Design a protein around this ligand. Structure first.
Ligand code: CA
Ligand code: K
Length: 712
């Protein structure tokens, strides 16, 4: 699909109480350092855009990855004509018509009805161009500068701004520089000033059109001017063409068709949202070398850095996808993450712009392990192993970094029930341990490998044979009494025991053994899927959106609206019965579309989009760190995959209509494939993957299973 046909309002109809993606309409280039979105309201906190709002407050320069994290280093540009009562966003707002506007990744175009202004914003990596067509005779641009700001006029065509605003940051004076060059000169000059929450009305007189070239920096005003200088001569049309070419660079790597063109539309909307995050967080100095801002020591340093990523979300799907089709990006991102470690002492958990510390676990370990076993950045692996071992053995004194309860985990073999969400912490630590072991193995560090492989079995500590669930345990080794399977919160993050008890990616065969047999585990999975989506709120004391999103649909406890349940259909592969979940997977894929309500829950920076992409192709990374993709059920009819190693995988399916709900047979390069997973190595060979599909199952009864520690 052409990038210009993507509508960025996809996934944008949301509120605090209910998510259909919690996406913003981000205009930007792939991994752009800034994104751009219309703001429709300032009265709803982080929910500052809604596609049904008919009010326009301004173009917002944003770094907001999610409404839960908030923004950093934002400002707004609002074209205005005539004179203003006061300069607040409310006093300057205009209505506009959503249905007459353009919202695409490479272009916003809209008319402010109050002022008779049509404007067009085209992005670039570090800046963009705003063209403003005025019908009236006294024409301006209002800059809204939240937080502490400075502004000065460099000359009659140029204004430099600095703003300090964020939701959380290690640098209390975290600065963003923004420079605007105007084709038509300012007709009122101003002196340097600074303050808080600035509103600066720039005047241009009676011109018919203004063209604003803008750029930005986290380094300095001078770096912002250098960023600008490198594109100051582009016309808007040329910048648009480059932006389209930038997106096509990624889109061309996955050319797919479907029986139903609505599915193709959905695919490409999710693909747009797969190449946004993590955002570029470095610039190119005068010698074209990477530099970035280090918020921890408050200094400019050489090297790459990336931001806006919670690994708890993104390790599941985003990086494994990059491992196939965007390895050059993966390579540079890993370098950035190592720089984060060098600068702060711990591998990052949630960058926005720096360590925010949210969510259980250190799932960056899975991003690293997956890269290691796939031979991505083998040169960095010795340093990563040291960083991971530090995270597993030292308690940070700063509460946002590393594992919480590191020492208790080592003392007891689990995080005890005195900690919040101790089940998630324990299971995440045990999986991390596995990831450390894998990195060690790739480096032939046998002693490390052995120790961490053993640690990775710590999930067994929280398994209660009485209930068949993971439960929190006190320091004397007793399970909390009064357990209820559907009770959310307290011991579990954003779920009940049903959404938390299967986070054992490293060792499903071992988890199965705790239930007693494959059959006992099968019965648990059937019960998970085939019950009503009941929930109890006692761990929170009220209903949260994740509960509502599960209860909005009839898919049992399989809460596809949130990351913990993403792998659930694949659990049937671990008992050799993937045919049981093939219809399920096709059904789950129908909960996604390209509309404002198009996702089942929070999209989370590529996380849910990449779930959709993998499942569309028919395979899924259940265990980052093994180099395997467990086979599911494809939605495409054809796909050409441009792999990073220069080869091509062609996927072809027999007719793939609504009634096709099973895999009949798979041939990889003309050889019958019966294993319930592919290896990364197999797929990287390229060639042809043919799925013959069925209207009834064709059980293979394979003795093969995807990777588990206890059977390797
Ligand atoms: Ca989520
Ligand atoms: K939805």
């Amino acid at each position: 699909m052409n990038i210009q046909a993507i509508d960025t309002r996809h996934g944008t109809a949301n509120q605090h109480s209910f998510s259909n993606g919690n996406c913003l309409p981000y205009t930007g280039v792939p991994f752009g350092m800034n994104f751009y979105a219309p703001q429709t309201t300032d009265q709803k906190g982080s929910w500052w855009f809604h596609p049904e709002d008919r009010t326009f407050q301004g173009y917002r320069v944003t770094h907001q990855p999610s409404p839960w994290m908030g923004d950093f280093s934002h400002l707004l540009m609002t074209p205005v004509s005539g004179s203003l009562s006061e300069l607040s966003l409310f006093h300057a707002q205009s209505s506009y018509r959503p249905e007459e506007s353009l919202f695409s990744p490479v272009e916003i175009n809209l008319t402010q009805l109050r002022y008779q202004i049509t404007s067009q914003l085209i992005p670039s990596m570090y800046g963009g161009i705003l063209t403003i067509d005025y019908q009236q005779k006294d024409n301006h641009l209002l800059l809204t500068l939240p937080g502490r700001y400075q502004v000065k006029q460099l000359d009659d065509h140029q204004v430099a701004v600095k703003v300090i605003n964020y939701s959380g940051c290690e640098d209390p004076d975290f600065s963003f520089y923004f420079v605007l060059h105007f084709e038509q000169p300012l007709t009122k000059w101003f002196a340097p000033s600074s303050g808080e929450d600035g509103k600066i009305l720039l005047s241009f007189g009676n011109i018919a059109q203004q063209v604003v070239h803008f750029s930005s920096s986290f380094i300095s005003e001078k770096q912002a001017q250098l960023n600008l200088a490198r594109e100051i001569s582009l016309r808007s049309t040329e910048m648009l063409q480059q932006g389209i070419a930038d997106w096509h660079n990624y889109f061309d790597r996955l050319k797919v068709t479907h029986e139903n063109p609505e599915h193709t539309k959905t695919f490409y909307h999710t693909l747009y949202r797969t190449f946004l995050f993590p955002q570029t967080f470095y610039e190119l100095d005068e010698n074209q070398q990477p530099i970035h801002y280090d918020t921890f020591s408050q200094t400019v340093r050489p090297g790459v850095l990336y931001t806006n990523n919670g690994f708890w979300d993104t390790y599941k799907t985003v990086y494994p996808l990059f491992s196939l089709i965007a390895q050059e990006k993966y390579e540079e991102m890993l370098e950035g993450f190592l720089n984060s470690y060098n600068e702060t002492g711990f591998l990052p958990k949630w960058l926005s712009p720096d360590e925010r510390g949210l969510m259980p676990g250190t799932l960056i370990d899975a991003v690293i392990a997956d890269a290691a076993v796939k031979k991505i950045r083998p040169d960095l692996m010795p340093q990563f192993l040291e960083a991971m071992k530090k995270g597993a053995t030292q308690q940070s004194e700063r509460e946002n970094y590393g594992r919480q309860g590191t020492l208790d985990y080592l003392k007891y073999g689990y995080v005890p029930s005195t900690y919040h969400e101790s089940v998630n912490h324990t299971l995440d630590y045990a999986y991390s341990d596995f990831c450390i072991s894998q990195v060690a193995k790739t480096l032939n560090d046998s002693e490390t490998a052995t120790f961490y492989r053993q640690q990775a079995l710590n999930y067994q500590q929280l398994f209660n044979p009485e209930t068949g669930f993971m439960q929190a345990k006190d320091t004397e080794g007793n399970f909390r009494p009064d357990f209820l399977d559907i009770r959310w919160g307290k011991d579990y993050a954003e779920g009940s025991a049903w959404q938390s008890s299967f986070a054992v990616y490293q060792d499903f065969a071992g988890l199965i053994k705790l239930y007693g047999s494959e059959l006992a585990f099968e019965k648990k999975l059937i019960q998970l899927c085939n019950q009503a989506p009941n929930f109890n709120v006692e761990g929170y004391g009220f209903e949260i959106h994740e509960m509502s999103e599960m209860a909005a649909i009839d898919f049992g406890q399989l809460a596809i609206s949130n990351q913990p349940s993403f792998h659930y259909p694949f659990l049937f592969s671990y008992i050799g019965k993937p045919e049981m979940a093939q219809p399920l997977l096709k059904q789950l894929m129908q909960t996604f579309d390209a509309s404002p309500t198009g996702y089942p829950g929070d999209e989370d920076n590529g996380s849910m989009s990449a779930w959709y992409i993998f499942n569309s192709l028919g395979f899924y990374p259940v265990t980052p760190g093994t180099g395997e993709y467990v086979i599911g059920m494809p939605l495409v009819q054809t796909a050409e995959v441009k792999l990073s190693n220069g080869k091509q995988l062609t996927i072809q399916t027999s007719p793939n209509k609504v009634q096709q709900q099973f895999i009949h047979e798979i041939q990889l390069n003309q050889e019958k494939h019966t294993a319930p997973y592919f290896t990364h190595q197999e797929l990287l060979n390229g060639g042809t993957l043919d799925y013959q599909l069925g209207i009834v199952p064709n059980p293979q009864n394979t003795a093969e299973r995807p990777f588990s520690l206890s059977t390797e």
